[PDB]
Amino acid sequence: IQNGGTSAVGKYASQIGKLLNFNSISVIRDRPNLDEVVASLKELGATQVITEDQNNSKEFGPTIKEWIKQSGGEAKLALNCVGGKSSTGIARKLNNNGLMLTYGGMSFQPVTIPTSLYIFKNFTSAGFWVTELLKNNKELKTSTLNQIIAWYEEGKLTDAKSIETLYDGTKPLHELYQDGVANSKDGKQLITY
Amino acid sequence: MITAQAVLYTQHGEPKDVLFTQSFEIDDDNLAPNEVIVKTLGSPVNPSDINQIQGVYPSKPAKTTGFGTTEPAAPCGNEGLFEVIKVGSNVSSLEAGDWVIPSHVNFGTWRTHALGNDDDFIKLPNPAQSKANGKPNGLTINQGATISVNPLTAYLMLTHYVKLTPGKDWFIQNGGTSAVGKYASQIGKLLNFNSISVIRDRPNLDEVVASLKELGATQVITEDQNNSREFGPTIKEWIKQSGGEAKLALNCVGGKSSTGIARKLNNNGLMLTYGGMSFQPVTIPTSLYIFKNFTSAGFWVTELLKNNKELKTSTLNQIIAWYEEGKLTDAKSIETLYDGTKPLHELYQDGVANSKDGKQLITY
């Protein structure tokens, strides 16, 4: 299960999940165009998408438990990039012996986990930082790249599709980057050469 | 001299039965110092206009012979947009070319022209004036013609009765796709109130829900969900998790719908009833009164604003501002242009009969 469901990472995790045949739940904030965002995430491989309101809901909990039982499996892993209530909700959805990895933190919000989960459900909460993990681990870095590469253009993985702007002398280089920073909300910005 | 046309009745009844068109003359060379002649640009058909003609609405213009009929006759329609075509010497508040609405109900807006006093009207900025004053948008004819009932109604119910804490508290309303409903959702977004809109189910529910959320509803549920024992706790969670409370219910349906929305309020809730879906009384469980300190009251914009020019002004000014700034949108009316090839009253009769198609605006 993961929050920040529309994030770039979120979108890759949904795909990789599908390739590895891992079932997944993406949590996203509600919006007027919910149906379209939900469809896009399911196309990428999210098995189920829920809102944060649904994530907050004691009433909805049993519905998620049914999904997991039906697959003859268990929710073993939570990926948190939001914090606060959202981190609380995704943690609660794990079966016993679950792990949360926190790899980001949207705006001020601490990772907030019910005591009962740690004591009675053997829950563990840890961090993830790709840089630190791979600093002195080139064998692991390259092994993972080799698989991403193979899936790439075996045609099995789809990149997130960037808005590119050519450095072609039309504008100075830093102005290209300055615009992509100012234009982050439109999507991932790639400067090409 | 101006030849004008007015939709009248001499006896209450159904619009299909009792309306007729009267020609009459307005003397444009003989204005008293405070008099104003206006020419109608458009006027809508609202349920209250119909109920007034029917004789079941306790606010109505007097029947007089002033349009040149033998029998005393009443005019029709309570809101509309007019253009000022001439003013008397002591009129400083209006000029030829200005846009106005009636300052009071019972003016009679289903007609081509009218003679009144300057205090019979309220100035709205015309498009030219709005653009000259630096605003990004001028009002449309539909926006001016329909500004006086439904937008003021939504604004006042939401702000005049209980103070909803911005960012936290909730109102709930039925008739979610009604004109007032859609204004209230927008006002809730604008003022930062959370809201639940209750609507009827339909084949294109996905599209309507998205539309209402874009306008500003926080949540949209069907009437089946409003009635549902199973669904009830999900709503209580929305409110609880927000840190606010559901303090106000807006009711325009009555019956089971009114029951359902009442039950979704926290303790010390207030319901305002401002409309009904035909013969369906307001129905509230006894338990809400006794154990939850519920209160149900009424809202009638006509009565509230009758002797409150200050409140009417302040409210109207804000709605005008939002239209000029592009922060408020009207529902599109079905417009029928009067060109003299068909009697005016028949245009209004068709509009009444076709009310289910959508809001009817007669234009000129």
Place this chain on the structure above:
Amino acid sequence: MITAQAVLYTQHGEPKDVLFTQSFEIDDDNLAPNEVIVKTLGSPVNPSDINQIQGVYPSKPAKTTGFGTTEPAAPCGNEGLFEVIKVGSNVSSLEAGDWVIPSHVNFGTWRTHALGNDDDFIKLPNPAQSKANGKPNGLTINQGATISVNPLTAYLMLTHYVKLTPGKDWFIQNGGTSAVGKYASQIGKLLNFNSISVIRDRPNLDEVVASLKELGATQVITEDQNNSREFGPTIKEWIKQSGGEAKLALNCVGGKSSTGIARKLNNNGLMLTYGGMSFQPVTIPTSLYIFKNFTSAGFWVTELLKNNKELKTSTLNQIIAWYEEGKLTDAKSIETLYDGTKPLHELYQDGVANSKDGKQLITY
């Protein structure tokens, strides 16, 4: 040691199904300094007591093993008159022979004895004390045992919400034959309020109408008259002749009855719903809210008085004084004496089943 009996339940449900009698022991030798032991003289069956047992009344005693059961069990009854039989050495507020009621709800009054502190009780003057203090009357057991809920309810509804002009204004109430209805009629007479009581038709209608008029109802109508459009103008005549207005409606029935009494109010009226004697919801026509500015609210004496001990005391004192002065009489009860041959819970079960006959008081 005293061997007492308490009426208990371990699970919510109908009194006929869930009630039983538990024998328990109280130590009446060697009282703690602040402790007080009381014997019941009588306790009534009120609808609230029954709703508590049924589990549809959100204020109730905890289920505990404190009466010597293995399953957690709740006592029954919120109202009753008790005689003090022994007090501890640091108790001066109370002495042997004193009359008391519980100071708080959820005491459990359907039982023979209790042990608490002096703050668990409120002293009422006993007949001997009233006469010694120079009063022409003292309280009866029924009057003491029913003083705490229904008279305060009637008094507060009539005085605490809207001010009726003495000698002019009206209230209208349904459930006119209820104990609360009977106190309201008397309090109306004492404060010089005009009133209309609505009652169900019955074979002995004339006798009932006479009783209620003697109590203080100005007019008594049936529910059929309440429903009647034809009869409405007659009521309007009464009110017009008085010079006053119908400003307040008291509803303990719901459904059509609640509709009828609301319609009889003058504009800007208030209704208080304090009960729902059929399961029917409060039903109000949309037009009353919108066009007559009607307001519908709740009343719950338990909630009103929770943090309003001054208001409780003042109200109770007035009822006591009126009884001592001979100005108020009790809504009469059918008394059933407990004597040990039939289990206590069965007396109360019979009382619940005979509710329709009238107020029931189990005596001791």
